[PDB]
Amino acid sequence: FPNWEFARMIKEFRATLECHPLTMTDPIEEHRICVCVRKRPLNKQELAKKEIDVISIPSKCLLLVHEKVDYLENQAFCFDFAFDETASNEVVYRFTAAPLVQTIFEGGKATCFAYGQTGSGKTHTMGGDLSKGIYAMASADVFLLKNQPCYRKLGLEVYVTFFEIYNGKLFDLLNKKAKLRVLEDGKQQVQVVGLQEHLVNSADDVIKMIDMGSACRTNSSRSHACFQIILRAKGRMHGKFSLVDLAGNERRMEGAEINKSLLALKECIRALGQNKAHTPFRESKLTQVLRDSFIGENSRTCMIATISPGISSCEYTLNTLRYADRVKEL
């Protein structure tokens, strides 16, 4: 009843729109830079306040934003994958993090980020509803891949880390929120001093670590959480996957550290894209710690831009989409 016949126009547009959504049998794609969008459904509180759903997904790659002016104006965005409200964590995982698990076994570096406004679904995507969770699904597949004959030969051990970044400070979530320190040497290599890697022999051990870690993390909407899977051959690093649940991108309080951090990340992803010798890693603790993952022939990244579909979040949604749009730009 409040926001005009805008809801009626949106419904009429949806009834005419013939859709071609993503399914689980669609072939997995191999991208150096994979940029996705994930729309979460309206919650019970949003449905109670009569929030209009202003997002449609007519294909595996296309996202539409419905704007009132006062007549319907539809804005289109194109991504590698667009996940609608029917997409489970399992479906999202398949097309994002899952193809990057093999990368770490070939001796590469992989990164996976969940980016978007607070309440959009980043933690739900990475950690789980409480149901997995990209961290758990990646961990499970790491242990399946290392039990295979090809890789069982390599003599690989699996280590894990889990830390958060808040106000330019790193805290170890597996070692009682200890304030670690990030150092850079004369060759631009970065080390997190005091960060202990934990040896794990099963995905069940990792789940206990994530749960141990998630219990620590607190507002958790103002911090980045980074979970790492590290493959070591004989103590020598073979491969690394870093999975990050970023701080909310929406904007007295502080959001200047977050915004510079997110801007720095975009530039680092963009630079990996262009196979550049230098990227502005130093501009944030997040990019400094992940420096190693934005360089190399066999370094790959995925970003999942999570969006809240309600009319009230429209401006924040457009900011998220505009940012994700500039992440994979030649």
Residues between 98 and 127 with contacts to ligand ADP, criterion CB under 6 A: 116, 118-124
Stretch that binds Mg ion, among 56-64, 99-107, 114-122, 310-318 (CB under 5 A): 114-122
For residues 108 and 299, the answer to whether their CB atoms sit within 8 Å is yes
Q: How far is the CB of 171 from ligand ADP (least distance, A)?
A: 18
Q: Rule CB under 6 A: is residue 221 a binding residue for ligand ADP?
A: yes
* 194 annotated to bind ligand: no
Using CB positions, name the residue nearest to Mg ion.
123
CA distances from 177 to 164, 174, 208, 225, 226 (A): 8, 7, 16, 12, 13
Residue pair 243/97 in contact (Cβ under 8 Å)? The answer is yes
Please, what is the minimum distance in Å from the beta carbon of residue 115 to ligand ADP? Answer: 9
* Residue 118 marked ligand-binding: yes
Q: Provide the β-strand partners of residue 328.
A: none
Cα torsion at 208, 213, 218, 222 (round to 10°)?
-120
Least distance CB 230 / ligand ADP (angstroms) = 25
The binder of ligand ADP chosen from 12, 20, 24, 41 (CB under 6 A): 41
Number of residues near ligand ADP (by CB under 6 A):
14
Among the listed residues 22, 33, 34, 40, the single contact to ligand ADP using CB under 6 A: 40
Q: Which is nearer to Mg ion, 2 or 41 (CB)?
A: 41
Residue with smaller CB distance to Mg ion, 242 or 279: 242
CA dist., res. 230 & res. 135, Å (int): 13
Rounded Cα distance, 154 and 231, in Å = 10
Count the alpha carbons within 13 Å of 327 in the hemisphere toward its beta carbon.
Answer: 29
User: Could you tell which of ligand ADP, Mg ion, none binds residue 66, using a CB distance below 5 to 8 A set by kind?
Assistant: none
Q: Is 310 annotated as a binding residue?
A: no
38 is in an annotated binding site: yes
For 303, 317, 320, the CA distances from 64, given in Å and listed in that order, are 19, 11, 13
Query: b/e per residue, 207-218, with b = 16+ CB within 10 A?
Result: bebbeebbebbe
Q: Which is nearer to ligand ADP, 92 or 229 (CB)?
A: 92
Among 56, 111, 117, 123, binds Mg ion (CB under 5 A): 123
List residues binding Mg ion (CB under 5 A): 122-123
List residues binding ligand ADP (CB under 6 A): 40-41, 116, 118-124, 129, 221, 248, 306
